[PDB]
Amino acid sequence: DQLLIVVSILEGRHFPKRPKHMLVVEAKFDGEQLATDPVDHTDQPEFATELAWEIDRKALHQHRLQRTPIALQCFALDPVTSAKETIGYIVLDLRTAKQAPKWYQLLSNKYTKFKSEIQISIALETD
């Protein structure tokens, strides 16, 4: 079967309310970049998106060996101008790949007084 690495980005918490702005999460794995839709920049933003990468059984073994990360980058989007500003990052571990979702703190968070976090699960699926 064709294998899928699937990252489910669920909701956020402890984010400042920015009424003119949206949030986008981008994720990159072995050079392939995916993104969520923009969602409202509330305190608990609702991403509710699955990002999935096709991978061979064999390539997956190499990546587990070298501990290849999945890099997530969180952006505040201005829908009037299309301006994106990086707000912070999250790094996911392939070894984590159903398992319960975990809450990940945004690293290098530009919202210095908020411990913003986004709940994420990662799994290996078929098809």
Swiss-Prot record:
Localization, per the record, is: Cytoplasm, Cytoskeleton, Microtubule organizing center, Centrosome
| Listed transmembrane segments | none
Q: Where is the C2 domain?
A: 1-104
**Superkingdom field:** Eukaryota
What family is it from?
Belongs to the CEP120 family.
Its annotated function is as follows:
Plays a role in the microtubule-dependent coupling of the nucleus and the centrosome. Involved in the processes that regulate centrosome-mediated interkinetic nuclear migration (INM) of neural progenitors and for proper positioning of neurons during brain development. Also implicated in the migration and selfrenewal of neural progenitors. Required for centriole duplication and maturation during mitosis and subsequent ciliogenesis. Required for the recruitment of CEP295 to the proximal end of new-born centrioles at the centriolar microtubule wall during early S phase in a PLK4-dependent manner.
Annotated disorder: Short-rib thoracic dysplasia 13 with or without polydactyly: A form of short-rib thoracic dysplasia, a group of autosomal recessive ciliopathies that are characterized by a constricted thoracic cage, short ribs, shortened tubular bones, and a 'trident' appearance of the acetabular roof. Polydactyly is variably present. Non-skeletal involvement can include cleft lip/palate as well as anomalies of major organs such as the brain, eye, heart, kidneys, liver, pancreas, intestines, and genitalia.
Q: How does it assemble?
A: Interacts with TACC2, TACC3, CCDC52, TALPID3.
Question: Can you name this protein?
Answer: Centrosomal protein of 120 kDa
